[PDB]
Every structure is written in structure tokens, then in C-alpha cells.
Coordinates of C-alpha atoms in Angstrom, one line a residue:
Chain A
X625 CA -3.8 51.0 -58.0
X626 CA -6.3 52.6 -59.9
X627 CA -4.4 50.9 -63.1
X628 CA -5.3 47.4 -62.2
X629 CA -1.5 46.9 -60.9
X630 CA -1.2 45.3 -57.6
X631 CA -0.6 46.8 -53.7
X632 CA 1.5 44.3 -51.6
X633 CA -1.3 43.2 -50.0
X634 CA -2.7 42.1 -52.7
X635 CA -0.9 38.7 -52.2
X636 CA -1.3 38.6 -48.3
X637 CA -5.2 38.2 -49.4
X638 CA -4.5 35.7 -51.7
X639 CA -2.8 33.1 -49.0
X640 CA -5.0 33.4 -46.7
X641 CA -7.8 32.8 -48.8
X642 CA -6.3 29.9 -51.0
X643 CA -8.3 26.5 -51.5
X644 CA -5.0 23.6 -49.9
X645 CA -4.8 24.4 -46.6
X646 CA -1.8 22.5 -45.8
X647 CA -0.2 20.2 -42.6
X648 CA 3.2 18.6 -42.0
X649 CA 3.7 15.8 -40.0
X650 CA 7.4 14.3 -39.6
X651 CA 7.7 13.6 -43.7
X652 CA 4.3 13.6 -44.2
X653 CA 2.2 16.5 -45.6
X654 CA -1.8 16.6 -45.4
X655 CA -4.0 18.0 -48.0
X656 CA -7.3 19.4 -47.5
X657 CA -9.6 20.3 -49.9
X658 CA -11.7 23.5 -49.2
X659 CA -13.6 23.0 -52.8
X660 CA -17.1 22.2 -52.2
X661 CA -18.2 20.9 -55.9
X662 CA -15.0 20.1 -57.7
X663 CA -12.5 17.6 -57.9
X664 CA -9.0 18.9 -58.0
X665 CA -8.1 18.0 -61.1
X666 CA -5.7 20.9 -63.1
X667 CA -3.9 20.8 -60.0
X668 CA -0.2 19.7 -59.2
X669 CA 2.0 19.3 -56.0
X670 CA 5.7 21.3 -56.2
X671 CA 8.2 20.6 -53.1
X672 CA 11.2 21.9 -52.6
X673 CA 13.8 22.0 -49.8
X674 CA 16.2 24.2 -49.5
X675 CA 19.4 24.7 -46.2
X676 CA 19.8 29.5 -47.0
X677 CA 18.8 29.6 -50.2
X678 CA 20.3 26.3 -51.7
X679 CA 18.5 23.7 -53.3
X680 CA 18.6 20.3 -52.2
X681 CA 16.3 18.4 -53.3
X682 CA 12.7 18.9 -55.3
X683 CA 10.1 16.9 -56.3
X684 CA 6.4 16.6 -57.9
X685 CA 3.4 15.5 -57.3
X686 CA -0.3 15.1 -58.7
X687 CA -3.1 16.1 -56.3
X688 CA -6.0 13.7 -56.5
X689 CA -8.7 15.1 -53.4
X690 CA -12.0 15.1 -53.6
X691 CA -13.6 18.6 -52.7
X692 CA -13.8 18.4 -48.8
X693 CA -11.1 15.3 -48.5
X694 CA -7.4 14.8 -48.0
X695 CA -4.9 13.9 -48.9
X696 CA -1.4 12.3 -47.2
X697 CA 1.3 12.8 -49.2
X698 CA 4.8 10.8 -48.4
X699 CA 8.2 13.2 -49.1
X700 CA 11.7 11.1 -50.3
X701 CA 14.6 10.2 -47.5
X702 CA 15.1 14.0 -47.1
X703 CA 19.4 14.6 -46.8
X704 CA 21.3 15.3 -43.8
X705 CA 23.3 17.9 -45.0
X706 CA 26.8 18.8 -43.3
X707 CA 27.2 22.4 -42.7
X708 CA 25.2 25.0 -40.4
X709 CA 21.5 26.5 -41.5
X710 CA 18.4 26.1 -41.4
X711 CA 16.8 23.7 -43.7
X712 CA 13.2 24.7 -45.3
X713 CA 10.7 23.2 -47.3
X714 CA 8.3 24.5 -49.6
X715 CA 5.2 23.7 -51.3
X716 CA 3.2 24.8 -54.0
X717 CA -0.1 24.0 -56.3
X718 CA 0.3 24.5 -59.9
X719 CA -1.9 24.4 -62.2
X720 CA -0.6 22.6 -65.7
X721 CA -3.1 23.8 -67.6
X722 CA -5.4 27.3 -68.6
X723 CA -8.9 28.0 -67.9
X724 CA -11.0 31.0 -69.0
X725 CA -9.5 33.1 -66.3
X726 CA -5.8 32.0 -66.0
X727 CA -2.4 31.0 -68.1
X728 CA -0.7 27.4 -67.8
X729 CA 1.5 27.3 -65.0
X730 CA -0.6 30.0 -62.2
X731 CA 0.1 28.9 -59.3
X732 CA -3.0 29.1 -57.1
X733 CA -2.0 28.2 -53.0
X734 CA 1.1 27.3 -51.0
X735 CA 2.5 27.2 -48.2
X736 CA 6.9 27.0 -46.0
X737 CA 7.7 25.6 -42.3
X738 CA 11.2 24.6 -41.0
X739 CA 12.8 21.3 -40.8
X740 CA 15.5 20.4 -38.9
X741 CA 18.3 23.2 -37.6
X742 CA 22.2 22.6 -37.1
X743 CA 23.9 25.1 -35.3
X744 CA 27.1 27.0 -35.7
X745 CA 30.3 25.1 -33.5
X746 CA 33.3 27.1 -35.3
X747 CA 34.9 29.7 -33.9
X748 CA 35.6 32.5 -36.6
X749 CA 39.7 31.9 -37.4
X750 CA 41.9 33.7 -35.9
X751 CA 43.6 36.8 -37.7
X752 CA 47.5 38.1 -37.8
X753 CA 45.9 41.7 -38.3
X754 CA 45.2 43.9 -35.5
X755 CA 43.0 47.5 -35.7
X756 CA 44.5 50.5 -34.5
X757 CA 43.5 53.4 -32.7
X758 CA 43.8 57.2 -33.2
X759 CA 42.8 59.5 -30.2
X760 CA 41.9 63.2 -31.2
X761 CA 39.8 65.6 -28.5
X762 CA 37.3 65.5 -31.7
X763 CA 37.3 61.8 -32.7
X764 CA 38.2 58.0 -32.3
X765 CA 39.4 56.6 -36.0
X766 CA 40.4 52.9 -36.5
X767 CA 42.3 52.1 -39.2
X768 CA 42.8 48.4 -40.4
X769 CA 44.7 48.2 -43.7
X770 CA 42.7 50.3 -46.5
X771 CA 40.0 50.4 -43.8
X772 CA 39.1 53.3 -41.9
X773 CA 35.8 54.5 -39.1
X774 CA 35.8 57.6 -37.2
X775 CA 33.5 57.8 -34.5
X776 CA 32.5 61.6 -33.8
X777 CA 33.1 62.4 -29.8
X778 CA 30.6 65.0 -29.0
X779 CA 27.8 63.6 -31.0
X780 CA 29.0 60.2 -30.2
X781 CA 27.4 58.5 -33.3
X782 CA 29.7 56.5 -35.8
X783 CA 30.7 59.7 -38.7
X784 CA 32.2 58.0 -41.3
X785 CA 33.7 55.0 -43.5
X786 CA 36.3 55.0 -46.0
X787 CA 37.3 52.1 -48.7
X788 CA 40.8 53.0 -49.7
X789 CA 39.7 56.8 -50.2
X790 CA 36.3 57.1 -50.9
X791 CA 34.0 57.7 -48.1
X792 CA 30.5 55.6 -47.5
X793 CA 28.6 57.8 -45.7
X794 CA 26.7 61.3 -45.8
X795 CA 24.5 61.1 -42.8
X796 CA 25.5 59.3 -39.3
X797 CA 24.7 55.7 -37.8
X798 CA 21.9 56.5 -35.6
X799 CA 19.3 55.4 -33.3
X800 CA 15.8 56.0 -35.0
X801 CA 12.6 55.1 -33.3
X802 CA 9.7 57.1 -35.7
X803 CA 8.2 56.1 -39.2
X804 CA 6.6 58.5 -41.4
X805 CA 3.1 57.7 -40.5
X806 CA 0.7 55.5 -42.8
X807 CA -3.1 55.8 -43.5
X808 CA -3.8 53.5 -40.4
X809 CA -1.5 55.8 -37.7
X810 CA -3.4 58.5 -38.6
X811 CA -6.5 57.5 -38.4
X812 CA -8.5 60.5 -40.1
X813 CA -12.2 59.4 -42.5
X814 CA -13.4 62.9 -42.4
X815 CA -11.0 65.7 -43.0
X816 CA -12.5 68.4 -39.8
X817 CA -12.3 65.4 -37.1
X818 CA -9.9 65.0 -35.3
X819 CA -9.3 61.6 -33.1
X820 CA -6.7 62.5 -30.3
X821 CA -6.6 58.8 -29.8
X822 CA -4.9 58.2 -33.5
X823 CA -0.8 56.8 -33.3
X824 CA 0.4 60.0 -35.2
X825 CA -1.3 62.3 -32.7
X826 CA -0.2 60.5 -28.8
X827 CA 3.8 60.4 -30.8
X828 CA 3.7 63.7 -32.0
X829 CA 2.3 65.1 -28.3
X830 CA 4.9 62.9 -26.7
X831 CA 7.7 64.8 -28.9
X832 CA 9.3 60.9 -29.8
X833 CA 9.7 63.2 -33.6
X834 CA 11.2 66.2 -32.0
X835 CA 13.5 63.9 -30.0
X836 CA 17.1 65.4 -29.0
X837 CA 20.1 62.8 -28.5
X838 CA 22.2 64.1 -25.3
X839 CA 25.6 62.6 -25.0
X840 CA 26.0 60.4 -21.4
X841 CA 29.1 58.2 -21.9
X842 CA 32.0 57.5 -25.7
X843 CA 34.8 55.3 -24.5
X844 CA 37.3 53.5 -26.5
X845 CA 39.3 51.2 -25.3
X846 CA 42.5 48.6 -27.3
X847 CA 41.3 44.6 -26.2
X848 CA 44.3 42.1 -27.7
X849 CA 42.2 41.5 -31.1
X850 CA 39.1 44.3 -31.4
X851 CA 39.1 47.7 -30.3
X852 CA 35.6 48.6 -28.3
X853 CA 33.5 51.6 -28.7
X854 CA 31.1 52.2 -26.4
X855 CA 28.3 55.0 -26.0
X856 CA 25.1 55.9 -24.0
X857 CA 22.4 58.4 -25.0
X858 CA 19.1 60.0 -23.5
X859 CA 16.0 61.5 -25.9
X860 CA 14.5 64.3 -24.2
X861 CA 11.8 66.5 -24.9
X862 CA 10.9 69.1 -22.0
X863 CA 12.7 67.6 -19.6
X864 CA 11.0 63.2 -19.7
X865 CA 13.4 61.6 -21.3
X866 CA 11.4 59.3 -23.7
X867 CA 14.2 56.5 -24.2
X868 CA 17.9 55.7 -23.3
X869 CA 20.1 53.9 -26.1
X870 CA 23.7 52.1 -24.6
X871 CA 26.0 50.5 -27.5
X872 CA 29.5 48.5 -28.1
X873 CA 31.5 48.6 -31.2
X874 CA 33.5 46.0 -31.6
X875 CA 36.2 46.1 -35.0
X876 CA 38.4 42.7 -35.3
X877 CA 41.3 42.1 -37.3
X878 CA 38.6 40.1 -39.9
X879 CA 38.1 43.9 -40.5
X880 CA 33.9 42.7 -39.1
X881 CA 32.3 45.3 -37.2
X882 CA 29.6 43.9 -34.9
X883 CA 27.5 46.1 -32.9
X884 CA 25.5 45.4 -30.0
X885 CA 22.0 47.6 -28.9
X886 CA 20.2 47.8 -25.6
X887 CA 17.3 50.1 -25.4
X888 CA 14.7 51.4 -22.6
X889 CA 11.8 52.9 -23.3
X890 CA 10.2 54.9 -20.4
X891 CA 6.7 53.0 -19.8
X892 CA 4.5 56.1 -19.7
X893 CA 5.1 57.2 -23.2
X894 CA 3.6 56.0 -26.5
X895 CA 4.9 53.0 -28.0
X896 CA 7.4 53.2 -30.2
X897 CA 6.2 53.3 -33.8
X898 CA 10.5 51.0 -34.5
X899 CA 13.6 50.7 -32.1
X900 CA 17.0 50.7 -34.6
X901 CA 19.5 52.6 -36.9
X902 CA 19.2 54.9 -40.0
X903 CA 22.1 56.1 -42.0
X904 CA 22.4 57.5 -45.4
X905 CA 25.1 55.9 -47.7
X906 CA 26.7 57.5 -50.4
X907 CA 26.7 54.7 -53.3
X908 CA 23.8 53.9 -55.2
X909 CA 23.5 50.4 -56.5
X910 CA 21.3 48.6 -59.0
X911 CA 21.0 45.5 -56.8
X912 CA 19.5 44.5 -53.4
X913 CA 20.8 40.8 -52.3
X914 CA 18.7 39.2 -49.4
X915 CA 18.6 36.1 -47.4
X916 CA 14.8 36.9 -45.3
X917 CA 10.9 36.7 -46.3
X918 CA 10.0 37.8 -49.5
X919 CA 9.8 38.9 -52.3
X920 CA 7.1 41.8 -51.4
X921 CA 6.6 44.1 -48.9
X922 CA 5.9 42.0 -45.7
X923 CA 5.5 44.0 -41.8
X924 CA 5.5 42.0 -38.8
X925 CA 1.0 41.2 -38.8
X926 CA 1.7 41.1 -42.9
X927 CA 3.7 38.4 -43.4
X928 CA 1.7 34.5 -43.3
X929 CA 2.3 35.5 -47.3
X930 CA 6.0 36.0 -47.5
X931 CA 8.4 33.3 -48.1
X932 CA 11.9 33.1 -46.6
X933 CA 14.4 32.5 -49.3
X934 CA 17.3 34.0 -50.9
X935 CA 15.9 37.7 -53.7
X936 CA 17.4 39.4 -55.5
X937 CA 15.3 43.2 -56.5
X938 CA 16.3 45.9 -58.8
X939 CA 16.1 48.8 -56.0
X940 CA 13.2 50.5 -57.6
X941 CA 11.2 47.7 -56.2
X942 CA 12.2 48.2 -52.8
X943 CA 9.7 51.1 -53.0
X944 CA 6.1 50.9 -52.3
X945 CA 4.8 53.7 -54.7
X946 CA 1.7 54.7 -52.9
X947 CA -0.3 58.2 -53.8
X948 CA -0.4 59.2 -50.2
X949 CA 3.5 58.9 -49.5
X950 CA 4.2 57.0 -46.1
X951 CA 6.4 53.8 -44.6
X952 CA 6.9 51.4 -46.9
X953 CA 8.6 48.9 -48.9
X954 CA 10.1 46.5 -45.3
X955 CA 10.6 43.1 -45.3
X956 CA 11.1 40.8 -42.5
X957 CA 12.4 37.8 -40.7
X958 CA 16.0 39.1 -42.6
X959 CA 19.6 37.7 -41.8
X960 CA 22.0 38.6 -44.3
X961 CA 21.7 42.0 -46.3
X962 CA 24.0 42.9 -49.5
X963 CA 24.0 46.5 -51.7
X964 CA 27.1 47.2 -53.0
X965 CA 30.1 46.0 -51.5
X966 CA 28.5 46.1 -48.1
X967 CA 27.3 43.1 -46.1
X968 CA 24.8 43.4 -42.6
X969 CA 24.3 39.9 -40.5
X970 CA 21.7 39.4 -38.0
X971 CA 18.4 39.3 -37.5
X972 CA 15.9 42.4 -38.4
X973 CA 13.4 43.9 -40.7
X974 CA 15.3 46.6 -43.4
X975 CA 13.9 49.1 -45.8
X976 CA 16.1 50.5 -48.7
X977 CA 15.3 53.5 -50.6
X978 CA 16.1 57.2 -52.2
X979 CA 14.0 58.8 -49.8
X980 CA 14.3 59.4 -46.5
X981 CA 11.8 59.5 -43.6
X982 CA 11.5 62.7 -43.5
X983 CA 10.6 63.2 -47.2
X984 CA 8.1 61.3 -47.1
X985 CA 6.8 62.2 -44.3
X986 CA 6.4 66.1 -45.2
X987 CA 5.0 65.1 -48.8
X988 CA 1.4 64.9 -49.7
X989 CA 1.7 63.4 -53.1
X990 CA 4.1 60.9 -54.8
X991 CA 5.1 62.7 -58.1
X992 CA 6.4 65.8 -55.9
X993 CA 8.7 62.9 -54.5
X994 CA 12.5 63.9 -55.9
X995 CA 15.6 60.9 -55.3
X996 CA 18.1 62.6 -52.4
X997 CA 22.2 61.2 -52.9
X998 CA 23.2 58.7 -52.4
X999 CA 21.0 56.2 -50.5
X1000 CA 18.6 56.1 -47.4
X1001 CA 19.1 52.3 -45.3
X1002 CA 16.7 51.7 -42.4
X1003 CA 17.7 48.3 -39.8
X1004 CA 15.1 47.3 -37.7
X1005 CA 16.0 45.2 -34.3
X1006 CA 11.8 45.7 -34.0
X1007 CA 8.6 47.2 -35.3
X1008 CA 5.5 47.6 -34.5
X1009 CA 2.1 46.3 -36.5
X1010 CA 0.4 49.0 -39.2
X1011 CA -3.1 47.5 -38.3
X1012 CA -6.6 47.6 -40.9
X1013 CA -9.1 46.2 -38.9
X1014 CA -10.4 50.4 -39.7
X1015 CA -8.3 53.1 -40.2
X1016 CA -10.3 55.8 -38.2
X1017 CA -9.4 54.5 -35.0
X1018 CA -6.5 52.3 -33.1
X1019 CA -5.9 49.7 -35.3
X1020 CA -2.5 47.3 -34.0
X1021 CA -3.5 44.9 -32.0
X1022 CA -1.8 43.9 -28.6
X1023 CA 1.1 41.4 -29.6
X1024 CA 2.6 44.0 -32.3
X1025 CA 3.3 47.1 -30.1
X1026 CA 6.5 47.3 -29.0
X1027 CA 5.7 47.4 -25.5
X1028 CA 8.6 44.9 -23.5
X1029 CA 9.9 47.9 -22.2
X1030 CA 13.6 46.2 -23.1
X1031 CA 14.8 45.3 -26.2
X1032 CA 18.2 44.1 -27.5
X1033 CA 19.4 43.4 -31.2
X1034 CA 22.6 43.0 -32.6
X1035 CA 24.2 43.2 -36.3
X1036 CA 27.2 42.3 -37.7
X1037 CA 28.5 45.0 -40.6
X1038 CA 31.9 44.1 -43.2
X1039 CA 32.6 44.3 -46.6
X1040 CA 31.9 41.4 -49.2
Chain B
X833 CA 19.1 16.3 -18.6
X834 CA 21.6 14.2 -20.2
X835 CA 23.3 17.7 -22.4
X836 CA 26.9 18.2 -21.5
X837 CA 29.2 21.6 -22.0
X838 CA 31.5 21.5 -24.4
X839 CA 33.9 24.8 -24.6
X840 CA 33.9 27.1 -27.8
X841 CA 36.1 30.0 -26.1
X842 CA 37.6 31.8 -22.6
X843 CA 40.0 34.8 -23.3
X844 CA 40.5 37.7 -20.6
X845 CA 41.2 41.4 -21.2
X846 CA 42.9 44.6 -18.9
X847 CA 40.2 47.9 -20.2
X848 CA 41.0 50.8 -18.8
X849 CA 38.8 50.7 -15.4
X850 CA 37.3 47.2 -15.5
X851 CA 38.3 43.5 -16.0
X852 CA 36.2 41.7 -19.4
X853 CA 36.0 37.6 -19.4
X854 CA 34.7 35.9 -22.8
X855 CA 33.1 32.2 -22.6
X856 CA 30.9 30.7 -25.4
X857 CA 29.3 26.8 -24.5
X858 CA 27.5 24.5 -26.7
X859 CA 24.9 21.9 -25.1
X860 CA 25.9 18.2 -27.2
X861 CA 24.0 15.1 -26.9
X862 CA 24.9 12.3 -29.6
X863 CA 26.2 15.2 -32.0
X864 CA 23.3 17.1 -32.2
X865 CA 24.3 20.8 -30.7
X866 CA 21.2 22.0 -28.3
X867 CA 21.7 24.8 -27.0
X868 CA 24.7 27.3 -27.1
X869 CA 25.3 30.2 -24.8
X870 CA 27.4 33.7 -25.0
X871 CA 28.6 35.4 -22.7
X872 CA 30.1 38.3 -20.3
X873 CA 31.6 38.9 -17.3
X874 CA 32.7 42.6 -17.1
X875 CA 33.7 43.3 -13.2
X876 CA 34.9 47.4 -12.2
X877 CA 36.5 48.9 -9.3
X878 CA 33.4 49.3 -7.7
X879 CA 33.4 45.6 -7.1
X880 CA 30.2 44.3 -9.3
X881 CA 30.3 41.7 -11.6
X882 CA 28.1 42.5 -15.1
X883 CA 27.0 39.4 -16.8
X884 CA 25.7 39.0 -19.4
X885 CA 24.4 36.2 -21.6
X886 CA 23.3 35.7 -24.5
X887 CA 21.5 31.9 -26.5
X888 CA 20.4 30.6 -29.6
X889 CA 18.2 27.6 -29.7
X890 CA 17.9 24.4 -32.2
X891 CA 14.5 25.3 -34.0
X892 CA 14.3 21.5 -33.2
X893 CA 14.6 20.5 -30.3
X894 CA 11.7 20.8 -28.0
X895 CA 11.3 24.7 -26.5
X896 CA 13.4 24.4 -23.4
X897 CA 11.9 24.8 -19.9
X898 CA 14.0 28.1 -18.6
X899 CA 16.9 29.9 -19.8
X900 CA 19.3 31.5 -16.7
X901 CA 21.8 29.2 -14.8
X902 CA 22.3 27.9 -11.2
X903 CA 25.0 27.4 -7.9
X904 CA 24.8 26.6 -4.7
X905 CA 26.1 29.5 -2.7
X906 CA 27.8 28.4 0.6
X907 CA 26.3 30.7 3.2
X908 CA 22.9 29.9 5.2
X909 CA 21.1 33.2 5.9
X910 CA 17.6 33.2 7.8
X911 CA 15.4 35.5 5.6
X912 CA 14.8 37.1 1.4
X913 CA 13.7 40.0 0.6
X914 CA 13.4 40.9 -3.0
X915 CA 11.7 43.8 -4.9
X916 CA 9.1 42.5 -7.4
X917 CA 6.2 40.3 -7.8
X918 CA 5.0 38.7 -4.7
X919 CA 4.6 37.8 -1.2
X920 CA 3.7 34.0 -2.9
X921 CA 5.3 31.9 -5.8
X922 CA 4.0 32.9 -9.0
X923 CA 5.2 31.7 -12.4
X924 CA 4.5 33.5 -16.4
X925 CA 1.2 32.1 -16.4
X926 CA -0.5 32.5 -12.6
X927 CA 1.2 35.9 -11.7
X928 CA -2.3 38.1 -11.6
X929 CA -2.7 37.9 -8.2
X930 CA 0.6 38.4 -7.4
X931 CA 2.0 42.6 -7.1
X932 CA 4.7 44.8 -7.0
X933 CA 6.4 45.5 -3.8
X934 CA 9.3 44.9 -1.3
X935 CA 9.0 41.7 0.4
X936 CA 11.0 40.0 3.4
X937 CA 10.0 37.1 4.5
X938 CA 11.7 34.0 5.9
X939 CA 13.8 31.0 3.6
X940 CA 11.2 28.3 4.8
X941 CA 8.9 30.0 2.9
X942 CA 10.0 30.6 -0.5
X943 CA 9.0 26.7 -0.6
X944 CA 6.6 25.1 -2.0
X945 CA 5.9 21.8 0.2
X946 CA 3.8 20.0 -2.1
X947 CA 4.0 16.3 -1.5
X948 CA 5.0 15.7 -4.9
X949 CA 8.1 16.9 -4.8
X950 CA 8.9 19.2 -8.7
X951 CA 9.9 22.9 -9.3
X952 CA 8.3 25.2 -7.0
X953 CA 8.7 29.0 -5.3
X954 CA 9.6 30.9 -8.5
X955 CA 8.8 34.7 -8.2
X956 CA 8.8 37.0 -11.3
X957 CA 9.5 40.2 -12.6
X958 CA 12.2 41.4 -10.0
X959 CA 14.3 43.8 -9.7
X960 CA 16.6 43.5 -7.1
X961 CA 17.0 40.5 -5.0
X962 CA 19.5 40.6 -1.3
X963 CA 20.3 36.9 0.3
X964 CA 22.8 37.8 3.2
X965 CA 25.9 40.1 2.1
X966 CA 24.5 39.9 -1.5
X967 CA 22.6 41.5 -4.0
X968 CA 21.8 40.2 -7.6
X969 CA 20.1 43.2 -9.7
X970 CA 18.4 42.7 -13.8
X971 CA 15.0 41.8 -14.1
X972 CA 14.5 38.2 -14.1
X973 CA 12.7 35.1 -12.2
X974 CA 14.2 33.6 -9.0
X975 CA 14.0 31.3 -6.8
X976 CA 15.7 29.6 -3.6
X977 CA 16.2 26.7 -1.7
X978 CA 17.7 23.9 0.5
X979 CA 17.1 21.2 -2.4
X980 CA 18.8 21.2 -6.0
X981 CA 16.0 20.5 -9.3
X982 CA 18.7 16.9 -9.1
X983 CA 16.9 16.4 -5.6
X984 CA 13.8 17.5 -6.7
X985 CA 13.1 15.8 -10.0
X986 CA 14.9 11.6 -8.1
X987 CA 12.0 12.3 -4.6
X988 CA 8.0 11.0 -4.8
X989 CA 7.7 11.7 -1.3
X990 CA 8.0 15.2 0.6
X991 CA 9.5 13.8 3.8
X992 CA 12.1 11.7 2.5
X993 CA 13.9 15.1 1.5
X994 CA 17.1 16.9 3.7
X995 CA 18.4 19.9 3.4
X996 CA 21.4 20.2 1.1
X997 CA 24.7 22.0 2.7
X998 CA 24.3 25.6 1.0
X999 CA 21.5 27.9 -0.4
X1000 CA 20.6 26.5 -4.3
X1001 CA 19.7 30.0 -6.3
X1002 CA 18.6 29.9 -9.3
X1003 CA 18.1 33.0 -11.7
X1004 CA 15.8 33.1 -15.0
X1005 CA 15.9 35.4 -17.3
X1006 CA 12.9 33.3 -18.9
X1007 CA 10.5 30.4 -17.8
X1008 CA 7.5 28.6 -19.8
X1009 CA 4.5 28.4 -18.3
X1010 CA 3.2 25.9 -16.0
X1011 CA 0.1 24.8 -17.9
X1012 CA -3.4 23.3 -16.0
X1013 CA -5.9 23.3 -18.6
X1014 CA -5.8 19.5 -17.7
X1015 CA -2.4 17.2 -16.8
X1016 CA -2.8 14.2 -18.9
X1017 CA -2.0 16.4 -22.3
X1018 CA 0.3 19.1 -22.7
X1019 CA -1.1 22.6 -21.3
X1020 CA 1.1 25.3 -22.3
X1021 CA -0.3 27.7 -24.4
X1022 CA 2.3 28.8 -27.5
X1023 CA 2.5 32.9 -26.0
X1024 CA 3.8 30.8 -22.8
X1025 CA 6.7 28.4 -24.5
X1026 CA 10.4 29.7 -24.8
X1027 CA 10.4 29.1 -28.8
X1028 CA 11.6 33.0 -29.7
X1029 CA 15.3 30.9 -30.5
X1030 CA 17.6 34.0 -29.1
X1031 CA 17.3 35.4 -26.0
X1032 CA 19.1 37.4 -24.4
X1033 CA 19.3 39.1 -20.4
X1034 CA 21.8 40.5 -18.0
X1035 CA 22.2 40.7 -14.2
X1036 CA 24.7 42.5 -12.6
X1037 CA 26.3 40.9 -8.6
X1038 CA 27.6 42.7 -5.9
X1039 CA 28.2 42.3 -2.2
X1040 CA 25.9 44.8 -0.5

């Protein structure tokens, strides 16, 4: 920024430009120096092995590598844990002494790998409570203890949740296929010249910002130990169907709501910017805690600098204050998200903030944004890349476009 | 090749207009779990059986060659009719020559008689498959023949293969590439390996 505060992209540059490259083969790390003239005389390697966030083993090794040379670091016998989960190894190069240009402790290079995974073969514990279904003309209502869910039979969405007598939502949980466009999406270098190939022009022309959801199906069924809700919606713009979404909600005796989503996208509509859900939660909390890539904003085509771990930040750090407001603050590769009493589990990307996508799209300057009531949550199964080979022509590469035609993802929503 | 399926869950439920069966299995080899598979079968009043499959693959097992279903059908028919890429054998990294259309061939043309027997006769990008009274719909790759995968793996020469009773059907949601930059070192490119960790696909099985 003009005051010399970093954008999140600066960390991506730092990581790709590092002077140490790493390879893993079994228990061995090979370190390669990309210095041309200096010996690595102010460098030590810290390694850590963690199991879904929890530390297991750790260590340090001095680096003694000639310019353009290699060093092989053998790791100790790593622990075999009992429990399920993925093991992660992280190495970081630390400069122990100050230089003319850096403090003591400066981190100059890092890298992360997956080690052994143990898949979870334990079935969930059978609860004695059965959720109860009530049918009115307008609603399906499910009760279990103090918890209550309500589904609107006309719109076909989850419209409210109660813990005790405290409402949890200000806006229903609905599909989202759009983002507040980024500068790379807008694709303009001269204010007088509009490119009809820019992503934002293609999305407005196809009617992605105006598309209306029509209900096809909304049904409720009692199983032995669960209530199952089934919905289907079609998004249409002037006759043409753009997207179809089929959903199941399974509410069991443990309180957990499992959401399964299947989406179809018309092959001749421009590929969508995302496939996910959004809602406005009623409560504002101070912290956000997640298990996934972080701690800074990261996107499918800008996530090599980010590391899998357990991260915990104040809500204000989950918003990037770009001077021209846009979609911002995404975290990819996430397995668990905790915010107030809610927990979401799955394999998803999310962003969380006090500004809606509609507000970020309508506002030309960051100082004109005002915090809305509650918190906006966007949870995505899939998200398009951001591009940036240039900013005045489409720059997202074909492997980061959502072009598959059919998409599946699942979430669990529970109260921790 | 030796992995054994252990049952985790098998449950049945009546809905308003359907029966729903739920199963889960784990494939294990000497303590280690390689794959988990969760399935639902929904049989409705129209006769159609909808199958939904979700698979998890351990990140440190070598990526699998395919993720699908197989069975041996009791009947032998003369023709195979499908809507999808064809008419010749095609694989995810060799399908640019094939064209989407409605194809109809005798069963014997769905087998490629390579002199050294192997996996053969796959058709990708398929939306509908008809064989005798059965119809399968979805988005899948399939192969159909009188030889099992076990027979093709054990037999060194094509003249020593014998037709089994009935027809073997393999229906895949996902299939690895075949490679061939060379044949004496791993040659499948990373975009054709099944490395995603989690996989979903669905089929409808009905009687036309």
C-alpha cells in the first residue's frame, strides 16, 4: 500500500523467489542453495511434524551448503500416531544473527509436504434422541432438544435456526455463483475502452448477477435416526437455465446437519466465478479459528506460500482492505472452521466478513464501506482463479476455470 | 491386488416413494486402510435404481488405476449400444480421435485382441449404455467383454483366453491414463493420475 503495508500477494513473491529449494525423499530432505557467491553462514533449518494442527516432533540443523551446492538432512525416526489424520512436515530456514537489512530470527525460506495418512474407519456413536419433524403449509420444522431448524416450503431454503430461543440467521442459506469482481475480472487499462471478452462483461451479459432461483422440488422424510430434506432449484435468465442445484440436508440425533450439494452448469454459459453457499449469521464474534491453508488470504492459483495448520485471527484480519473493494479474504484447503458456537467441516474454501458481495461490488472506495448487521459467510466447494498475467485481457489459465459441467461437495454444520 | 473389503455399515429405510439402502466398506492390507467407499442405493416406483458413490483414497498409497464397479451379468447379447465417445477403444489420455455420437457394435468389437492380454476396450465420456434389457445412465467410462480382469492378468497369450459364463461389465467413474512416452519407466502425466483424494460419481440402473 502507499504507506508501505504489504498486500497478501507480497508473501507469494517471497516464497517463489526464495534462495533455498527443497526436495523430500523418504526421511531425507535435500537442500539446494541458489546463492552464486556466499556460503550459507547465517542459516539454520527448523523442522516440525504435526497431525491435523497438533505438534508431534520438532528439531533444528545448521545449514552448511556451498553456493549452488546440496546438503542432505536425514530426519530422526518419526512417530507413528494411533489416531486418524494426515501428517504434515514443515521446514523453515531462519537467520539467527541480524544483518544490515534484517532482524535476528528473520525467516528467509520454507516448504511443506504431506507424510503418512491414516483414514478414519470409526463409525459415529449411535445417539438415543430422534429429531422430530413438523409439517405446516409454509414450513418444515425439525426440533432436537433446544435446537430447531426451519425450511421455507416456497423458497426451498433453510430460513432460520434456533439455539434455545436465540435466532442464528439474518438471511437464508442460499446458493451463490458470483463474486464481487476483481480488477483482473474488470479488464480495463483505459477508462474509455471496454473489452467485451473481460470476465465481468461475459458474466453480466449472460445474466449471472440477475439470475432468479425457481423451486423444482422440496420434500421431507423421517428415517430411523434422522430427518432428510430434499430440494432442487433452477437459476434462469430470460428463458435460458444457467445452473441447477440438487441438495440433501440430513439432520441426525447428534445435532449435526450434513449438507450434500450437486450442481450442473450449462456448457455454453461463461464458466461461473464460484460454486458455494452464503448466509448472514446473526452474531458477531472477535476470533476466527480454522484448520487449513493460511494464515494470509490465498486463492486456487495463489496458494503455494500458504501452509496447512491451525490458524487463529481476529475477524478484522480476515478482510483485505484493497482501496478499490472486491472479493477478498478467501482461505482455501480448509477442513474445519469455527466461529462463535458454529463449526463447519468438509473440504472447502471460505471467506468471512462484515461486508456482503453486493456491497463490495457497488462501492468504489474502501472508506465508503459500512459494516452490516451480523457476519457474511461464503462457503465454497469450488472457486475460479484470479489471474494477473495482465489486467486488461482475460488471464485465468484453463486449469483454474470451473469448466467441468458437474460439481459435488459436502459440508457438516454443527454446534461446538 | 490383495486388498480385502470389510463392512462398516449396512442399513435400510423406507421413504414415501422409495427404499434407501446405505453401505460403507474399508479396503485394508495388513493393518493399513487404502480406500473407503460410502454408497446409497435409491430404488423408486418407476423401477430405476440410483446409485451414488463417494470414495476416499489414502494420500500415501500409490494412486489407483480406476474407481468403479464391476459385476458379471448372467446374459450374453449380440449387440452393445451406447451414447458417448467412439466407436473405437479410447482412454482419458487417448480420446481426441473419438467422437460423441450414438454407436452400435457387436459384442466381439468391444474387445481389443492384443497378443499380450491386458485391460482393453474402454469407452470414455459415456452418458447411456444399453445391453440386453439393461440400461445404465450417468457420466462414466465402461468396458464390456467375456474376459474378467483376473483372467486377462493371469494369461500370457491371447490364444489361451477362454470366454467365461455371462458378460463382465466394468463401469468407472474415473480411470487413470495409459502413458506411452516410453514403456520402461513411469510415463503417465500428473493430470491423468487419480490424485484428488476424494471422488464422487452416480449411476442409474434401469430395465429398458
